[PDB]
Amino acid sequence: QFQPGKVYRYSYDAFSISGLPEPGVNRAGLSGEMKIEIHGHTHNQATLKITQVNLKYFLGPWPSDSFYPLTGGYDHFIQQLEVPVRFDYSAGRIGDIYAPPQVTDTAVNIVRGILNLFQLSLKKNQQTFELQETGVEGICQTTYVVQEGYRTNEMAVVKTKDLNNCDHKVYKTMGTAYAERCPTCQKMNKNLRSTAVYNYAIFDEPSGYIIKSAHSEEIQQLSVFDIKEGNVVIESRQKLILEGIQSAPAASQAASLQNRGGLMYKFPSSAITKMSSLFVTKGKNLESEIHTVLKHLVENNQLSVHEDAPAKFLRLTAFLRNVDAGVLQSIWHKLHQQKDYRRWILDAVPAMATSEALLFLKRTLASEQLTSAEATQIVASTLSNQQATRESLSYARELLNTSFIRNRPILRKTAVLGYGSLVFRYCANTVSCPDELLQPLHDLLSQSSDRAKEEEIVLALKALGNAGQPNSIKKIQRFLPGQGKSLDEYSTRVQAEAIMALRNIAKRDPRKVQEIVLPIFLNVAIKSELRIRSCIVFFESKPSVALVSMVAVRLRREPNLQVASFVYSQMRSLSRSSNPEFRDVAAACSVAIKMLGSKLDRLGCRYSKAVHVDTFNARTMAGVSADYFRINSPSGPLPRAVAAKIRGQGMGYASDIVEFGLRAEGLQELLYDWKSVPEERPLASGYVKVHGQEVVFAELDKKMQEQIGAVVSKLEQGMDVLLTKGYVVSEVRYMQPVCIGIPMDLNLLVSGVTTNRANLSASFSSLPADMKLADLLATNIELRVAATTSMSQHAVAIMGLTTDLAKAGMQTHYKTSAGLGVNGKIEMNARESNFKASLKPFQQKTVVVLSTMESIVFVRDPSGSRILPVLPPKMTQKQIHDIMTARPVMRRKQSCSKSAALSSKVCFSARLRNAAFIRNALLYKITGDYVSKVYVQPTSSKAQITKVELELQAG
């Protein structure tokens, strides 16, 4: 509609503000005000040129005019916004946008926010209509109402977008791969609800519809709990006003022809990891910043953890994410011989989560620079913390081919399970997993069956279990029980692992797993253990009423009582679930149970069982479920296997938290063209899964004095030991464009630093010179100790707007520091059965647990941070004025517990100031400020020492 030869001049103002939706509390956000010109060209293109831009941040109470200039570091960005942008526009639909490569995607996305207003899908004489319409946010459901205004030719159009009903939603996530959508929980409550409404005054002119003015309003409303328990909101608004239409002289189009894609927002490369919410890294000297914070962490957490150590670790990680594997290598090279720098750096690697970390790792392992112990801590951390991409998957594959890893069993095991987890995370968001990703693992399973190596088949099945892909089902089925006339060539152990390997698969294709495991369960010729496992798999896949009924009817005549006991107890137990995730299965079990008597509930402990317990809170919309399985054998009272799992539900998703299993077949057996696979009969085996992913398993087969004189010698000479650990406990991030074309960012980061130091010096007397352990166990061993164990954990939750150079929003920060010290003497004598500790007491008030919480709104850029508390310190007999308050009131608590024997007291102090005065809602109760202290204190009796002495035996 822009007429060739015509220049349309507009003023454009936009902002996006985050915070609690309450008048009076502080909010923060970003804003701009521009003048723009759009020149119409031929061939249904036009060029938009921004002619003046004033960038602002918002920091203050809303409504208010707390908008201020964003000052330094923006000149280059402003010059990029000012380059002409060509766009295709025909009958009101934006097509492709073209801007030079020096104009960054950030700058193009802000242009897409303006162009989004010009998307006008008007259908000539329909007053109200709807359609899936492309915008900067994606393609979503849009409804229009077209009315006649009062000037003539003029129309009022108003359109509204349901941003939760989209054929395509633009967004990026980190950290959510193991979360499984809980359909029931999502019908109870929706966590992020978004809508945008565009209001126009339009002129119907032969050239086509031209906008006289547009105003938008968009709300992104986050409910972390139920919707009535408080929300955090991002509200964005644009105002576009036509200021003039002018004839423009003889052309010579000046705009780029570099195609930057369509109107939908485009995430800058690697934005989800590189662009931090907390830290500005663009434009800084990276290697230098990394050096400074790395020095601070190493140097400041020597005797105890520095209060901010977890936040510096988060800083260190944010900077590392911005450097390649070459910079990593230059840093390692300078510090790998310093024990502490070394340790801090290898901790930082898994936390980076980028493919450059994994390349550095591959190179360090291959050049043999790490020990076995470090490699096993890290190979582990790194593979699984990856923000999986194709390069990640390649370096991970090359890693399985590394000799250093292959030559080491526990490490090869970890790397292969890890590769499976990495596949699962890459494939989690796709409809279809590319086959080549599973190739290393199907190849291992195929070569392990060809070599008839049972251990290797087990490892591959478990890893494919981790990878969780339906593409694996055909390869796994070869190892399952009952897949043909039986070609008994695999042990129960291998078959059991093949059945367990279907579990993550069932999260994506439960129907295809049910089809497999139901005939197995129903086959009365199959060993009990294997049927029971198929029943565990079946129930976790959330079967329908009819399927569960089929099982219950088959139980009326089940010949194996182990199998009957198990199934009957699983159904009875699940029928009592009160957790939404299990609602449908639990009702299926209700109905099924009516189909038989209750006599199997009389079977005792010699019989297999399953128990499900759970709990859900409707206000938090969060809950936890636990299960425990005991598979028994007729052979005896020791279980053939036991497992227990715990799972969590929240925000409409669920995840496994941790699961442990133990199997003990041999142990039992000792207490009471084809080529068969030789059965390694492990006395026992065990594994551990975290979020559904098997992270370690071990077997106990046939594992049923120079080494000590050295330690005593080491001990007599004195030992100083320090172990610190830096780590990211969880990091979840959701980013999505708001209508103005910058991304909103919801970020949960929990990191922690632990420091443990011990100085130990041992004394003995007439110890025989040819000392043995038994001589040690028979003397007076005096151990002098100076030891400290301390820990600090920070949880940061953010909702705001983020770009490389300016971030704004709301943040709640929870920090907890704990630490205890011990300086004294321990005197032991194993034969005299006497133990003795002489500890120096607390001399002064000593804080042992420090916990703070602070909710702020912030604007961060290279100039640094500007921060306000969410609850303004001040705004607007005893009881009344306190309760009937328009302001926050500091509350105070303080308990004690005196020790007479010790002349010392353990106190708990706390100061609370939150937002409950505003709304009776859970989020408002944890929003504000809080400081709590668990401390120990004297009195004056001046205890010199405090001795704990034990004496067993005859005296």
């Binding site: 107890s569 009875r572 137990s573 009592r576 679930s577 209750s598 509930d601 009389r602 069982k609 128990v611 499900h612 317990v613 007491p841 007479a900 024997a901 010790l902 002349s903 009796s941 001046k942 205890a943 010199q944 020492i945 405090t946 001795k947 704990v948 002495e949 034990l950 004496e951 067993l952 035996q953 005296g955």
Partner: protein, 174 residues
């Protein structure tokens, strides 16, 4: 088994005065094969008549008793905790009675609170039925009976009132 354990926690004051606590764990298989244990605890000050005395007995009649005496001579304050399993009307049943003698006015607060304020609230946050009264003034009983392996009825006898609930289905067998 017969053995004993002595533990002393001593705070060495400046004065040299004796300060601290001495505990002496005892244990055997007294009276008739059924395990027994005791815990005595005294202050180290020769001036002290304080004494904490705690006894356990795992009786034949599938009971488990345990008393606790503390104060003046470990007989100033008393509190027992008797637990039995068995049959109530042909149904497996179980029972715990927490009894108490004199309590230091302090603890008296905690009890009279949770028996007058706490209890009714837990009882309705669990929606239990509520009869006029259950006898004995310095006692608390809880009776559990499995009507079926998964169905249990529970009776909670407080001094001033009985709370009860029938047909509670459990997620596991009793």
């Amino acid at each position: 088994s017969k053995p004993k354990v002595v533990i002393v926690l001593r705070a060495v004051r400046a004065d040299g005065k004796q300060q601290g606590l001495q505990t002496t764990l005892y244990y055997g298989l007294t009276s008739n094969g059924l395990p027994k244990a005791k815990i005595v605890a005294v202050e180290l000050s020769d001036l002290s008549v304080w004494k904490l005395c705690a006894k356990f007995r795992l009786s034949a009649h599938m009971k488990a008793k345990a008393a606790i005496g503390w104060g003046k001579n470990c007989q100033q304050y008393r509190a027992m905790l008797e637990a039995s399993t068995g049959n109530l009307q042909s149904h497996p049943a179980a029972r715990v009675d927490i009894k108490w003698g004199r309590l230091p006015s302090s603890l008296q607060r905690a009890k009279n609170a949770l028996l007058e304020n706490g209890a009714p609230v837990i009882a309705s946050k669990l929606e239990m039925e509520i009869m006029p009264k259950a006898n004995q003034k310095h006692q608390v009983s809880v009776i559990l009976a499995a009507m079926t392996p998964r169905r249990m009825n529970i009776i909670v006898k407080l001094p001033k009132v009985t709370y009860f609930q029938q047909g509670i289905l459990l997620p596991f067998t009793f």
